[PDB]
Symmetry: D3
Amino acid sequence: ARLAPQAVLTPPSAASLFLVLVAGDSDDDRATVCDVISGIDGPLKAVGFRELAGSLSCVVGVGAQFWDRVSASSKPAHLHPFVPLSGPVHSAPSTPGDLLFHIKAARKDLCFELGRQIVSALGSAATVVDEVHGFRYFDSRDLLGFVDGTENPTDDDAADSALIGDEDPDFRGGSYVIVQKYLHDMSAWNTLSTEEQERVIGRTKLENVELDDDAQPSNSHVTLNTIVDDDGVEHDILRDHMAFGSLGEAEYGTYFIGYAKDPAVTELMLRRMFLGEPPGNYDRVLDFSTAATGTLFFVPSRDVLESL
Amino acid sequence: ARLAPQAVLTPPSAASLFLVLVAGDSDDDRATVCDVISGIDGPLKAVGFRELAGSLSCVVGVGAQFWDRVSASSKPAHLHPFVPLSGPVHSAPSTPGDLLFHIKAARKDLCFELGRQIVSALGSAATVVDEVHGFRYFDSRDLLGFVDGTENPTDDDAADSALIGDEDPDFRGGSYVIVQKYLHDMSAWNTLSTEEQERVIGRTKLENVELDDDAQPSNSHVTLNTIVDDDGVEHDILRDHMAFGSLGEAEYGTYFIGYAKDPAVTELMLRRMFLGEPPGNYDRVLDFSTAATGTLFFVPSRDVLESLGD
Amino acid sequence: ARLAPQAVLTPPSAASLFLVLVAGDSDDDRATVCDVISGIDGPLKAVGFRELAGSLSCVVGVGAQFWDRVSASSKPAHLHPFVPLSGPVHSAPSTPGDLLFHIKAARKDLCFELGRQIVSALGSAATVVDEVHGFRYFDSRDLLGFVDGTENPTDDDAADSALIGDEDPDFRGGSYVIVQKYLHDMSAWNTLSTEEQERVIGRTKLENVELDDDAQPSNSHVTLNTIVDDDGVEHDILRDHMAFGSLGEAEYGTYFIGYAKDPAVTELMLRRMFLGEPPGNYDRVLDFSTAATGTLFFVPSRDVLESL
Amino acid sequence: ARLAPQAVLTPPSAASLFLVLVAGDSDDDRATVCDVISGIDGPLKAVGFRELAGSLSCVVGVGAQFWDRVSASSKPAHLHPFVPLSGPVHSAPSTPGDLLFHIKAARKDLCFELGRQIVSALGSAATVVDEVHGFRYFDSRDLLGFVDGTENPTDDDAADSALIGDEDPDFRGGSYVIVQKYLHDMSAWNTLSTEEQERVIGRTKLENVELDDDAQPSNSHVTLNTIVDDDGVEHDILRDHMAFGSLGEAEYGTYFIGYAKDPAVTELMLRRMFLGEPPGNYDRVLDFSTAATGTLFFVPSRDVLESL
Amino acid sequence: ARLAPQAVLTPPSAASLFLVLVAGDSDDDRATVCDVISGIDGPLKAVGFRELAGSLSCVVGVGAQFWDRVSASSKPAHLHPFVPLSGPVHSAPSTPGDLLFHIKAARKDLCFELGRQIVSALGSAATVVDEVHGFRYFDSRDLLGFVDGTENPTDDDAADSALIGDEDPDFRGGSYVIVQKYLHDMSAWNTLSTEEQERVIGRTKLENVELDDDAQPSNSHVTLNTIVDDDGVEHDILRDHMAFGSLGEAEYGTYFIGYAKDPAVTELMLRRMFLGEPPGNYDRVLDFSTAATGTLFFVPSRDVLESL
Amino acid sequence: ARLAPQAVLTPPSAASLFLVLVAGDSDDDRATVCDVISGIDGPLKAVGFRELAGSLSCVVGVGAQFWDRVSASSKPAHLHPFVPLSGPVHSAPSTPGDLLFHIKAARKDLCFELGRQIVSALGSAATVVDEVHGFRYFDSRDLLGFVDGTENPTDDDAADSALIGDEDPDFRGGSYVIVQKYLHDMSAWNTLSTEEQERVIGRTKLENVELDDDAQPSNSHVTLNTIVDDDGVEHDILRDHMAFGSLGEAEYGTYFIGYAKDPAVTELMLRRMFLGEPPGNYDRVLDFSTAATGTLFFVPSRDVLESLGD
Ligand code: HEM
Ligand code: HEM
Ligand code: HEM
Ligand code: HEM
Ligand SMILES: [Cl-]
Ligand SMILES: [Cl-]
Ligand SMILES: [Cl-]
Ligand SMILES: [Cl-]
Ligand SMILES: [Cl-]
Ligand SMILES: [Cl-]
């Protein structure tokens, strides 16, 4: 997929832009927004074509509520606003957003330029409500210093995990994407030893190897995020984390973004993380990371997107 | 597709070579030509294997006349010579060519060496009548200074636009390619202002953003080259422009090359360009660009290519 | 084919590692081996995910004997051990191996690190019986100075040539691989003129252009390794040579690895080379190269491998 | 210069970090700050050594006031706080800063990591007061769309322009650096035609060619920033602009940074820009760009820096 | 040596452009030419600054006749026109040129664009009399298939060899350059065996290893081009060949460019090649290469050039 | 410095080759050896010219014994065999070698091919006694998992540290290089925790940050290898480590190579490491790393190198 919108399956990139917008309550607003995101390949190629590599991609997400404003029937099976979580200790807020632009390329400028054109076409019809500029941090690490995104599926595995789906054939090729902007408590995290940190995560730190079953804490992040159903089938999401931050504001962040053919999978992971399994046995990553956003979007296929 | 001939759908490259040749009249000539082209997979790997990235590609095109010498039996549905167009001030000549090699690579030497080995194999069985060494100019601009190749289809849209399907199943996976070598009038073009240039093209110059409907002249190159049928169904082609030129001769060029599943789409684009729509409302790019060549070729799929003549 | 085990079709690489191992007889060995190899994309992802480019790949092969010890249930049609060849002047030995790891990447460190993790995870359950650290030598040459790999099938051709096959539905997507470690007599080779070396190979040395029919000796490496059936159809294999060696030991090597959906094609090339066509008219490449190893492995699809 | 602090002469980079800090009024503050910036190569190599290319560099600037707190004699000839400007229409503010870290590398992460280590070593002894993450925008353009930094001197030209100087031999190898964070009025600027924009700048837009003398407006940026003395000697600075911004905050910026052996040159340019020459005939770039900062720092040589 | 005119010492490049021009006789011509060439780093920076890598370079040469028309004041010691050579079988013509632009970069577009700007700035004041678009051919080979440029001096050696010179203080830092455009007879060349071609050159073809003393013919290109003085000191030049050509015209070329602090060294190589050592024993490279041009230019230092 | 031999100051590379050889006893042997090494500029260009970046470099080192066979006249100030050290549990053997080739490039094949042509020229006039194919391991870490090479001097500091100056003007621009091939005990080392490993080294593991004075053991590798004279003047060396190993043999290595203007600086580092400071307070890296070789060589400047023997 070179220069196509809704390229959910792209590998990771040196640079990302996450733009989250709310739509004008007006009628003229709903119409410009629709006509801009439905002609999204225009600016995608307008920027992207200037780089020989063609690394630029753009996935458009539309939140449940705005989807209702532009389409009666049909609606995809699982589109709903992001479900908030109130855990023993930690909370995942559900925050506003009608549009997501998830932008990737090999260079920052390519990203920024696509974002500039998008934001400009929208004018006063929409309002930026969250904006992260992500960046690869050494060998795909997060600011907690672990290699992050490892066990992502790929090739056929990834298409079955992320993309609808004979099960909902009107929206075949689409996906459900959840975003969460996490901020970290660096100083707290740095008071753990490497080994404690590894126990919190589920893998070794430098060498990025999974801890043995007989050594792998039942509340480790890896454990809480493994999903096996009754039949013993595993269910995976496609994740695309990036680091971001501000030195002066002491803000160090991980931007979570996860794609799935069914958001039941992503939501189950989030429940096991915030509420624990067994209940109360929650993910220690949450002791060091706080989600400031939580938004759920439908990712239309190219065809479905182009028709709005 | 890596080191396979007839890879129509390859992304743009840093360097290209376009060779157009005319075949000899004899029966020797025609059979040498069929050997070289049906076994083009050989020189392609002989050269291209030597570069780890395997960027080298080579698409072979056969003209309508030569096709009749080789396979009178069985002609693809729309293969004919290039249709010359002739407007009041600007014309699109129909110039000779039996063979097209459209070569792309990340490096000049690979393009050159492949060309060299091909030309060497043909020997006196063919003559080069056009040769262009193309090169990427800045951020994929053409010598007029505009980003060029932008609205080209990609992925599935591209395959559908460019390759013969069910409509002509005997030649599924082939294409029709048209080439034209254009020369520009740089000082004429430089007397225009940016804003005027933008009105000629249909997009802003630096930022490559499409002009909105209301600012978009009916004879902008973009407007004229938009093909929408009565059904309201859009028809695209796959274009592959490269810059070329010579500073001493004051030649500044764009080499045009368009692939289509049906050349009717390309031919209509050319009519709207040269004859205008409504009539006489022609494409002002042509005020600054003169076509020195125009030739149509059939691009056989690999299976078909391997069978000539034989 | 990003970070998938059994990516047989991958292109040449700047670096590769070839590991051959024998398993222990203990049932516990039997089981360690099967754990590690069936979970192979754990380490493949543990390591490979640290490279932005994702160039790392790892193909696992399993020997006939070892397959039997683990799945007397079903066998792939052509899984037998490597057949030794004993020819008028030169011979191809049949040497041990239960496991092949064919590892490739853009960098040595990735190859070495994947190997480190595999070997170490197999612990005393297995023993490295041959180890070759291969490298790209100039413009895809081998140490005899010829561009080597030129006539490999690509894309569809390659899949047809290398992957099973309606002809064996239970092992669809797998392959058979034969390795042979060759050592060259450099000084002898250098007494030939370039033209002589060209006559041995079947192609020109610098330009890598195939010699025409009337100047192609009938025992050139190329003629011998052309396999055309009675209907005039050509049967190809997918090959992956790398250079290797040691300056002080005066070892200058070519590691041969050949993939095919039916190893009989490979095996036939080997016979025409070693014994000759017609018999006695053998590949003069063998006057300057000696096979120190010869082993055949079955390459399972991901599904079959994941379930061993 | 690989991995040396005070590498004023480095070429431009894909990524930059500009950090401006104020020092604690305390005594313990003055001491940690001194010992951190005087051991600045420690973290420079600590981060920089992890990249094969070694593209990371770090220039440290110390403002006049803090310089006084740590050194009586000696003081460089021209160190003083940045002079504010009140022009016919436009104003250059003079804003706080004791320390500048001007950081460059081929990757964002390298920059951010160096900044993280610096800010962390400083702890509560200093406070970030300005922070820009710059990025190359296409072919060295600024967000106004012009190629920017063209006429920079280089090689010997650049060392004579930027570096002291037999004229002040205690501080030979040092430099004076002025920074200004500009924000742009994109919408206003976009209402000019290309040709007007070119007249404002002094060069053509796409092709980056200098306008002819007989066509070059006397109030163009190029004109106002050409410095010839009585004898007709030209005086140049070394400039190292980067773009930065925020889509949601509609902030589009150019970060100015200019190095000179004598700040008289930079200040004269700034006077001709804000006040005009003839007076009132000012730089139209200022009609579209507003400076939010203005700070002047001394850039000690390596030797002078290491001794504090 | 970043974006400086008269960067004689730069390494090989992937692309280059060689422009030779004759000036008109009008005094206005005289002056246009001198404006453009003395301001040459204007365009060099206009173009070159757009590439992050800064690989673009441009060396200006000036012919003897044209120098006279512009500076009868002082002349560099060795500035005379190219001396034709007329030998037993082959001749080197002396062809016109007043200006040389030797342009190099990592990409053709940079070369072409610098050329476009120069030629266009010279307008009708000058005429391009020869134009070669040179390219790197595989591993630094020329179209005869040999690695070509191997024995170039580097670093200090190169400066000693190419740059004037206490021996001519007024033109310290300049050089003399000789260009010759060669066309090859490819078919004739291919009738030689590789060994014969090696005997012609003086080195092995694929491995680029120098033939040992007893197998080096006395008329090999290498022997002939070895210049050793009476004290046994070797005098070298700095060379910059590129391949060029046209497939349809069957033109396969090597563009020779040679730099030296004293052109007599270059000139002597030329004599030993064309006329032979001993006389008649001439460079058999000339049986397969014909010089279509031959011109000598003086290469001013930046200071001298900037003041013409 | 591009394609010049004896480029001591080159930056780290992706690949290296370290060859150590012993010369034959004859007079033929010694003169072949002097031909090959004094004209090493030839193979260096023969190989290295073929790569556009010109990353290839080759530094030649001559042992003290062989130096006496070639230039009894005139010996540089500090040239002697490697001084073996012998502590209670860990030793630094002094192992044979007359010749060192320290080869660096961006690619393995260039290193290999240069080695091949050198070894081929020497013929039976020399024997390889050690050979290591080094490789960059992740973000310049060594097999112990730590970033390694960090505090190496750069620029002028480097030149001053590594090259002979006024002190020995007959050999200005030369150096003294010491090599040791270390083998690691990976399972011993893996039983430690990160924090302990950090205490062994003197820096944090992932982030490569120096530990502060108060957390910094007196026998950390970093502490022991800091050389400060009574004047309070620091003395550094130029180090060039590469990883190497073989998975089947369970060999995991660090190849050490240090350059100094005076080998006294390197030798003292080794004493503090092996014999400890205060005495017995040795470098715990040595609990996990065993030296299999130790050899000292003089690195002649180019001018000096060109003159042997002759
Ligand atoms: C600050 C937020 C987060 C940090 C720092 C973090 C970090 C990690 C790390 C270090 C790993 C192990 C490497 C890998 O296999 O990718 C991991 C794995 C994983 N993470 Fe998280 N993560 C975060 C948020 C989440 C959230 C919110 C979800 C679910 C909605 C999640 C889903 C997963 C999954 C599914 C895996 C792979 C588990 C497996 O199959 O081994 N991540 N992440
Ligand atoms: C020392 C070991 C070997 C060396 C140096 C060697 C070298 C070559 C060279 C130089 C070519 C021509 C370029 C190309 O198409 O790759 C070639 C072709 C070939 N080689 Fe070999 N080879 C070796 C072993 C083998 C073995 C053992 C087999 C079969 C099991 C083999 C199968 C082939 C095939 C199938 C081709 C393509 C022939 C064609 O054009 O159809 N190679 N090899
Ligand atoms: C928003 C702020 C600014 C923008 C967008 C801007 C943009 C430009 C552009 C487009 C050029 C022509 C290309 C070049 O030669 O670099 C230029 C040149 C120049 N600029 Fe500015 N600039 C800005 C601020 C300044 C400031 C504050 C100074 C002085 C303190 C300055 C000093 C120069 C100098 C010395 C030149 C080269 C003049 C010559 O010799 O041709 N820049 N800048
Ligand atoms: C068609 C034109 C030419 C071709 C194909 C050619 C080819 C070669 C080749 C293959 C080498 C050996 C590798 C090397 O050191 O570069 C060489 C060396 C050399 N060439 Fe030529 N050359 C040509 C013209 C010339 C001319 C006209 C000169 C002198 C004006 C010349 C001067 C040299 C020098 C100085 C060397 C190095 C000799 C040495 O080892 O000392 N080249 N050239
Ligand atoms: Cl961005
Ligand atoms: Cl070409
Ligand atoms: Cl390896
Ligand atoms: Cl940053
Ligand atoms: Cl050019
Ligand atoms: Cl090696």
